[PDB]
Structures are given as structure tokens and as C-alpha cells.
Nucleic acid binder design. Structure first.
Ligand SMILES: [Ca+2]
Ligand SMILES: [Ca+2]
Lengths: 244, 244
DNA sequence: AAAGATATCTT
DNA sequence: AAAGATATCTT
């Protein structure tokens, strides 16, 4: 399917190619930075061509946002089915060692999930799926990457800012956790778990209806949450009390 | 000086090279996206080797943050002058048509400017200068040719997501404005003016002491600024009255 | 954890 | 503008 073909293409492309720099039209190469900020940009650009290639094989148009603070990264849709749009968003995180627990931020809990047209390319009720493409890289220990430039014959001398990178495709609701991923920017937190848990889809929500309801009523601070719910157990108890 | 040599080298490099993609160690090239999240990253990486080359000719050490979430991008200093450190930060913004008015976010007003060791590589009082390397680009809409991968022999055929990149080097206090650059992430706002105003330093503050005092006492919300000051005129009146 | 830093944009 | 979106990290 579109999903199985996209997952296989992403696994493959990642296995084959290691991004190592930015290149000018003149052929001069500038090495990469160490932060997640440079690597989440690089992972998004890396996935673009793949997503477009797989979508075209399946008859889906691909549209990126026109505005800069909108979701999702990629909107897939057949022109004959306007309300079967698929949302694909790329998220990234790091580990210091290969097998520790990781976690992502999964977008806002106060924007398009509470308002049908807030910060989103198409009305939220036109989407039938919300997929996360998750990248995880292991930081290199060196905090002094290269400060020189390179030519096309020195490609294999360029220090890579990661040791290993893994990628998965999973539904957003399935890997969603019950604790905020950020405070002032109010992001859904994902589960806090090993990499295999995201691939396998071992979450905490019983359904996408429960995931949406949880995040739609989650309070912005601890103070407010202490009178309602802080976690999935307290949310289920809030449901028993009659949403009060 | 360090400064004059730095801006000549930045301006020259901008003029002679055009970034057009991310390259892998295998040689495959991925085209660029058109938003500031991508261009911000590319301009930082492009400037890194230039900053280090010029810094080294003046006998300055270049140190980058060891942790994410810390200012500044580049800390320059001599072993003989440890309390005369120079902070350099790269800021980027865009324009829809060449030469319209622009504005930048200049860093938090609630971190290192109010707490000497908050979110900064070195205590804030060891720095004697805070420079901004400002990048401005005109946005160019992505087309179909940006959605595939390229080989090195097609470098000059890759479509760029930008045009007319301009760069300046200026003191943070000199280009600082009196209105916040962001709400929930409490950043200082720069003046709102044309590129030449930034080059020439036509800001609203009379001194770096006034800049600092203004942003150290600026309240986070309009509700609170209503009773204090919202702009330079109100701040100067408040000061005239005895800070009340 | 919770809350607020890191940079910039939109309405 | 002011206020809160865009991603993700630290503490
Ligand atoms: Ca996104
Ligand atoms: Ca910075």
C-alpha cells in the first residue's frame, strides 16, 4: 500500500545514504552542525524526494504548506477523494547511546485539534490519517565538528555529526503519551520508550478517539490539571465522574 | 579590525557562492526547502568556516555551545583577555519582494540579560560585545524540479528556494527596537525597517545601557505594560518620573 | 515533571 | 501589536 511502500522506501534510503554537508552551485562543501536543529532540517529535506516518489506511484498529489507555521509537512490526496487526505509530519530526536528510551514532541494540543482550521493547510476534518515519520540519531561524542570547507573529491573525509540514524513511520495517536512534550508551546508528548516500541506501536491510548479527547481537554498548567487530570488514569477517572 | 575583516569576508562569500542542496557521502544531492527553518540552518553553516578563518587571523579562539538552548552561536576570545569575550549570533528573516521592510527576533529578554549565567555559554558579564550577523532573503516558491534527487554533474541545474540574499554585521543593542519580537518565547524585537537601516545602525536606543535597562524591566504582557511602558517614549517618561 | 529556554512567523 | 503558533530541548 502507500504506507508499506513509504516505510520500505524510507528504511532503504536511510540505509544507503549518509548526509554529510551542504553544497554550493560552485561545488564547495560546508560541513554540518551538531545540534538537533541542523539534523531535523536535514532529515526533513532528506525525506522529501522519497515521499514524493512513493505518493506519485499511488496517484496522490503532494502539497507542502504555503505558510511557515502550519501543519502538516506533507499533505497527500487523490483529486477524486478530497476528504481522504493523509497528513505526514517529520519529527526528530537524539540518543547518547544506541539503546536508551527516547521521546518526541508531537505537535500542538491547542491548535488544529481544538480548531478545525487553525494552523493547518486543509481543514482538519478532511484528513483521515496523521502519520509521523520519526528519525532518531545517536550523537557523536565530539562537540567540535569541522570548521573547514571541502571539495567534491573529499566527500569521505567530512565528519558526520551522527553515529547511526533510525527511522519509523507510525500513526500519531498510537505513539502519543499522556504528559506534555513542551510547556509554553503546549505540545503533545509521545510515549517515553525504546525505539522498538514506536515501530511496534505499543502505546497507552485505547483508541484515536481517546487520544483526541485526552489532548483536547488537557489543561495548560499543573495547577489546573490537579483539579482535573494529569495522566491517563486520572483522565479515565474524570470520564467516570461525568467530565467534571 | 576583526569586525571590518569579518564583514568583508561574509559579504564576499555571499556574493561568490550559492547553496543549493544537502549532499551525502555517496554523492547524492537533495534540494532545499523554501522556509526560514531551512535557510536559517544553511546560513549558519555557511558562516561557520568564515567566522573561524577571520577569528584565527586575529588570534581569537572560537567556541560553540556545548548544550542546545544556549547563546551565543559563536564565542570569540583571546586567552589573554578572558573577560573581553565577543558573542556572535546569526539571525535570519525573509522578504516577499526584494527590499521590503524587515524585522528580526534578537534573543530572549528573560534569560542571560536578567540572570548572568542563564542559558549562555559563559557568564554574561565576561562579554564586552554582542554582534548579530543578519541574513535576509527574498522567498521563491518551490517547483516540481525541487522534488527529486540530483547528481553532482547537475549542480547548476538545481532550483534554489531563494534570491537576493543580503547580509549585515551589527551590534545587538544598536538594531534593537522597543517591541517584543515574540510573545510566549519572550524575545527582544529588532527595529522594523529596511536593510540599510540595519547596516547604518539607525536603532531607537541612545546607548547599550538604555537598551539593557529597557529590556530588563519590560513586562511580558500588554496587561502589565499598560501600567509601566510599552514603547521608548513611555519608557523615557517612566525614567523621567523616577521609575514609576 | 513542569515550566520555560533555544529561533522565527502569522493573524 | 500582541499573542500564540511552528520543533525540541533542559533542568
Ligand atoms: Ca511540521
Ligand atoms: Ca543562536
Amino acid at each position: 500500500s502507500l504506507r508499506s511502500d513509504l516505510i520500505n522506501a524510507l528504511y532503504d534510503e536511510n540505509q544507503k545514504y549518509d548526509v554529510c554537508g551542504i553544497i554550493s552551485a560552485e561545488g564547495k562543501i560546508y560541513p554540518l552542525g551538531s545540534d538537533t536543529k541542523v539534523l531535523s532540517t536535514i532529515f526533513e529535506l532528506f525525506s522529501r524526494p522519497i515521499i514524493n516518489k512513493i505518493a506519485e506511484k499511488h496517484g496522490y498529489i503532494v502539497e507542502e504548506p504555503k505558510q511557515q507555521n502550519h501543519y502538516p509537512d506533507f499533505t497527500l490526496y487523490k483529486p477524486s477523494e478530497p476528504n481522504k487526505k493523509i497528513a505526514i509530519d517529520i519529527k526528530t530526536t537524539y540518543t547518547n547511546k544506541e539503546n536508551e528510551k527516547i521521546k518526541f514532541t508531537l505537535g500542538g494540543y491547542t491548535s488544529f485539534i481544538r480548531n478545525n482550521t487553525k494552523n493547518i493547510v486543509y481543514p482538519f476534518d478532511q484528513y483521515i490519517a496523521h502519520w509521523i515519520i520519526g528519525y532518531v540519531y545517536t550523537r557523536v561524542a565530539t562537540r567540535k565538528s569541522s570548521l573547514k570547507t571541502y571539495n567534491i573529491n573529499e566527500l569521505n573525509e567530512i565528519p558526520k555529526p551522527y553515529k547511526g540514524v533510525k527511522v519509523f513511520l507510525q500513526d500519531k495517536w498510537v505513539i502519543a503519551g499522556d504528559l506534555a512534550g513542551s510547556g509554553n508551546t503546549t505540545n503533545i508528548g509521545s510515549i517515553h520508550a525504546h525505539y522498538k516500541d514506536f515501530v511496534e506501536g505499543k502505546g497507552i491510548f485505547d483508541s484515536e478517539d481517546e487520544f483526541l479527547d485526552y489532548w483536547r481537554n488537557y489543561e495548560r498548567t499543573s495547577q489546573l490539571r490537579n483539579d482535573k487530570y494529569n495522566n491517563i488514569s486520572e483522565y479515565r477517572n474524570w470520564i467516570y465522574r461525568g467530565r467534571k
